[PDB]
Amino acid sequence: DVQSAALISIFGSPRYFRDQRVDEWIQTYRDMLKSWELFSMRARFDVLRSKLSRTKTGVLTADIKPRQIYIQCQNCKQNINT
Amino acid sequence: LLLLHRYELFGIAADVLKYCPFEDIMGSEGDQSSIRLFCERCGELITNESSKEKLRAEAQQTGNKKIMDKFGYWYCDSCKKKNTSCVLCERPLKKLTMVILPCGHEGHFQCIQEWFLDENEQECPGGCPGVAFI
Amino acid sequence: MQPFDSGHDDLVHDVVYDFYGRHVATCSSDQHIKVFKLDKDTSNWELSDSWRAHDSSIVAIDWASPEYGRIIASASYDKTVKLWEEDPDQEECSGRRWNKLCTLNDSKGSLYSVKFAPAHLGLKLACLGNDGILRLYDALEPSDLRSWTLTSEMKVLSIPPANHLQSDFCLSWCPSRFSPEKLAVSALEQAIIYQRGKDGKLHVAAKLPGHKSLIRSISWAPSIGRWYQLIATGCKDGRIRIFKITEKAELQSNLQVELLSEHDDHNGEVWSVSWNLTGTILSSAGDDGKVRLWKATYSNEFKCMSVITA
Amino acid sequence: MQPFDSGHDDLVHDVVYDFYGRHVATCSSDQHIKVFKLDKDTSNWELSDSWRAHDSSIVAIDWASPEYGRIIASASYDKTVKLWEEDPDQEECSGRRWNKLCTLNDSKGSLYSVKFAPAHLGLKLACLGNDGILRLYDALEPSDLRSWTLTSEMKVLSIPPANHLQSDFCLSWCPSRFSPEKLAVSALEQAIIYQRGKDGKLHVAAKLPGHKSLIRSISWAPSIGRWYQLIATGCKDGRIRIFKITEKLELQSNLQVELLSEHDDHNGEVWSVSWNLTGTILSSAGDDGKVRLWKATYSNEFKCMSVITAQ
Numbered sequence: 001d002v003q004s005a006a007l008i009s010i011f012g013s014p015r016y017f018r019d020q021r022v023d024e025w026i027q028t029y030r031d032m033l034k035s036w037e038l039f040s041m042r043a044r045f046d047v048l049r050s051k052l053s054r055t056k057t058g059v060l061t062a063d064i065k066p067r068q069i070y071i072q073c074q075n076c077k078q079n080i081n082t
Numbered sequence: 083l084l085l086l087h088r089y090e091l092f093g094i095a096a097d098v099l100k101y102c103p104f105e106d107i108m109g110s111e112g113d114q115s116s117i118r119l120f121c122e123r124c125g126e127l128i129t130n131e132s133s134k135e136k137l138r139a140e141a142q143q144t145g146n147k148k149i150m151d152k153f154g155y156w157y158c159d160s161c162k163k164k165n166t167s168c169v170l171c172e173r174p175l176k177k178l179t180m181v182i183l184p185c186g187h188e189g190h191f192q193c194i195q196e197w198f199l200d201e202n203e204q205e206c207p208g209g210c211p212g213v214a215f216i
Numbered sequence: 217m218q219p220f221d222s223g224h225d226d227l228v229h230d231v232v233y234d235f236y237g238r239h240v241a242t243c244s245s246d247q248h249i250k251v252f253k254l255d256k257d258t259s260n261w262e263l264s265d266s267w268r269a270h271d272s273s274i275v276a277i278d279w280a281s282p283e284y285g286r287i288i289a290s291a292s293y294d295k296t297v298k299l300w301e302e303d304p305d306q307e308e309c310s311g312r313r314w315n316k317l318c319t320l321n322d323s324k325g326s327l328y329s330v331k332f333a334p335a336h337l338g339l340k341l342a343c344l345g346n347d348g349i350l351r352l353y354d355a356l357e358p359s360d361l362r363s364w365t366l367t368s369e370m371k372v373l374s375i376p377p378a379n380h381l382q383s384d385f386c387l388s389w390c391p392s393r394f395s396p397e398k399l400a401v402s403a404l405e406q407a408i409i410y411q412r413g414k415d416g417k418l419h420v421a422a423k424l425p426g427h428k429s430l431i432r433s434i435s436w437a438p439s440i441g442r443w444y445q446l447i448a449t450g451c452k453d454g455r456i457r458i459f460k461i462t463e464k465a466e467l468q469s470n471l472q473v474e475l476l477s478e479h480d481d482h483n484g485e486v487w488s489v490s491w492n493l494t495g496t497i498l499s500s501a502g503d504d505g506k507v508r509l510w511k512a513t514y515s516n517e518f519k520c521m522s523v524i525t526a
Numbered sequence: 527m528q529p530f531d532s533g534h535d536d537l538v539h540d541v542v543y544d545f546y547g548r549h550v551a552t553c554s555s556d557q558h559i560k561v562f563k564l565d566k567d568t569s570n571w572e573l574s575d576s577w578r579a580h581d582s583s584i585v586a587i588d589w590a591s592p593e594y595g596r597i598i599a600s601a602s603y604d605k606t607v608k609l610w611e612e613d614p615d616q617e618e619c620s621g622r623r624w625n626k627l628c629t630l631n632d633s634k635g636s637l638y639s640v641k642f643a644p645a646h647l648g649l650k651l652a653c654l655g656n657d658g659i660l661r662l663y664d665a666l667e668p669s670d671l672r673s674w675t676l677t678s679e680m681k682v683l684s685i686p687p688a689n690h691l692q693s694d695f696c697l698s699w700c701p702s703r704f705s706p707e708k709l710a711v712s713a714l715e716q717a718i719i720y721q722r723g724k725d726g727k728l729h730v731a732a733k734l735p736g737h738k739s740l741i742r743s744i745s746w747a748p749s750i751g752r753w754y755q756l757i758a759t760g761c762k763d764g765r766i767r768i769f770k771i772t773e774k775l776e777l778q779s780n781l782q783v784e785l786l787s788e789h790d791d792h793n794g795e796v797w798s799v800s801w802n803l804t805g806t807i808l809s810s811a812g813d814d815g816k817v818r819l820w821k822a823t824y825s826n827e828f829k830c831m832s833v834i835t836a837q
């Protein structure tokens with residue numbers, strides 16, 4: 001029951017520590033959700049993982065998806081997101 | 083053209099401007115809707131000169147110009163990036179995108195419209211705290 | 217049970233699902249590949265395309281990862297592997313819905329099994345024929361999916377078998393993104409696990425003991441999150457062997473293999489063995505005409521639960 | 527569309543549309559700028575915001591191009607020109623919906639006319655008031671809207687006047703995209719056309735004759751395909767003068783000014799003149815509160831089409 005394991009683990013595994021088993025369960029549940037074509041539920045799982053990774057200070061600890069767009073400026077000809 | 087722009091007829095203005103025999107009607111900078119991207123893994127600019135040159139040579143040899151449809155800016159020739167994926171469905175994305183602004187994530191029209199209208203969700207569907215609502 | 221006719225004029229050899237479980241590809245000895253889609257409304261299997269693929273009998277096909285597009289490999293007995301990409305701007309049931317990409321004319325023998333590596337390893341391939349040579353084909357150039365480069369060439373069998381003696385080969389990758397690259401390769405009577413080393417080349421890692429006869433099917437169970445991996449093997453004997461693998465020169469991790477169970481319920485030859493998505497239900501077909509479903513008990517012993525006669 | 531009443535407590539001096547014909551901005555003498563937007567539902571004008579801008583009566587206004595944002599420039603008697611930009615963040619009709627960008631406090635006398643250049647010149651602002659000098663302000667970087675540099679300063683009058691109160695300075699730009707830059711100055715009673723030469727400095731192109739009284743307005747005509755261009759001027763006597771301008775390629779082109787018409791149907795003082803976007807239908811204001819529409823006849827002269835009076 002990796003679904004219940006992941007949905008319980010995201011309540012404070014990367015917020016307080018870091019173990020490989022929780023990341024394995026999270027990736028396995030995300031792959032299963034992709035395989036069932038539950039992309040909306042995968043997105044809800046991702047935003048819940050982002051929301052529950054807020055520390056006491058406020059620094060996010062979730063391994064979020066990296067940026068895919070780096071627009072080049074028309075005038076200065078440099079990266080707008082550095 | 084300015085009179086057409088004064089009314090809400092922009093597609094007609096685009097049709098008029100696309101096939102105008104005069105080449106310097108609106109602006110002289112050339113391409114002002116052209117967007118250049120840096121790569122998400124190496125940081126170099128996605129210009130793809132090698133792929134365009136090879137596909138131009140191949141299409142010159144084989145005659146048909148459908149080989150040049152394989153050229154695109156969804157891959158990087160320096161870092162050998164395979165494809166850019168949709169933020170919701172994780173499928174290859176080649177022809178039309180819908181970029182979420184504050185976080186810089188891709189999307190099909192149907193996928194992004196589904197997540198931001200049908201599901202009534204105000205967050206980015208890729209795990210982003212910045213509320214890019216509607 | 218609802219039987220649907222696939223429409224081939226000869227024996228249907230291999231049937232494989234896609235990643236999303238709504239498309240099935242059937243190869244046969246009539247030199248044809250057929251792709252069937254599962255209709256959402258009518259809930260009946262209907263044909264999408266049917267095109268001639270090879271000049272001999274196709275025996276193994278595989279779907280690619282859905283994040284690399286829709287690519288179907290096809291390994292036939294004419295010493296070719298052909299990769300097929302769908303262009304959706306064609307009519308269905310026409311023969312032009314799946315476009316040819318590349319022919320791999322490097323195999324000197326009749327190919328038996330073709331498999332895609334998992335998506336975290338890239339767009340890789342794995343071919344095996346009666347020449348006894350395991351070949352890995354990558355997709356390095358991302359602009360065109362027609363330049364596939366051979367990268368790993370490992371010899372499984374020392375000499376190829378003669379034409380009068382039968383042979384069977386099968387492959388199974390490692391569906392684990394959190395483990396190093398592994399490959400279960402089934403020779404005639406041998407089962408070898410190949411691991412990717414620090415030098416970028418495959419090496420012999422472990423061998424599954426037993427297997428006094430021909431191995432007909434190999435299958436690596438999905439790692440749902442457990443600490444032990446599972447390999448299921450169906451031999452020419454009646455044995456459905458399940459191997460439990462625990463992972464801990466020039467190899468990133470040495471691995472130990474212990475036989476978990478051994479079942480003689482089929483009383484014949486286990487032609488095919490497979491796994492579920494979560495590795496809880498096994499399915500095994502045999503010469504008794506019955507497909508058995510196996511589930512692990514509380515004490516980690518697999519016991520049959522259903523028998524489906526045909 | 528039906529007429530509507532503004533909340534202004536004094537005389538409205540200049541009303542100017544936006545580009546898209548849905549946003550209207552009125553500057554008045556009670557120190558208020560009220561901007562109204564045309565609602566899609568029921569086709570009625572609705573208020574956007576109302577903020578005090580200057581310390582005197584505001585006599586000029588001109589929107590900028592929508593590609594440079596919702597910029598409104600207002601000129602008043604306080605010798606300053608202030609630029610204002612809409613903010614969707616603040617609530618409508620709150621008063622904080624608009625924000626200043628730069629105050630053009632580079633004048634000694636009260637400024638009368640502010641006008642925005644055609645978009646192929648960039649973001650350029652024309653200012654003319656009681657000092658007798660035409661001030662041109664350029665945005666050398668259109669990226670930032672708070673930076674404004676004076677670039678051209680041409681003395682349109684020989685001497686400063688004595689009766690500074692009895693003066694009116696009006697400006698009008700030339701919407702020809704591919705002709706050289708042309709600017710119209712009506713300083714006190716003389717109308718001057720200014721063309722940009724090869725040296726990069728403005729020069730006197732041609733002079734409109736006549737104009738026996740103070741020129742209260744000026745408007746250039748959008749020439750859609752015509753080989754000649756039209757200028758509408760309005761004098762204090764009530765005479766509406768339509769000049770015919772022919773351009774043939776130190777300036778690189780000479781201008782031949784030929785008077786085409788002179789109408790005195792307004793028994794008063796023509797405060798404002800205007801063109802429609804075709805350069806055909808001309809409308810004029812007056813001291814009688816009447817609005818007269820003028821259209822070209824079969825001949826080369828113009829004739830009145832309707833007299834819109836207010837009761």
Ligand SMILES: [Zn+2]
Binds near residue numbers: 074075077078
């Ligand atoms: Zn820049």
Ligand SMILES: [Zn+2]
Binds near residue numbers: 125
């Ligand atoms: Zn790159």
Ligand SMILES: [Zn+2]
Binds near residue numbers: 190193
């Ligand atoms: Zn998508």
Ligand SMILES: [Zn+2]
Binds near residue numbers: 182185186187206210
């Ligand atoms: Zn995002």
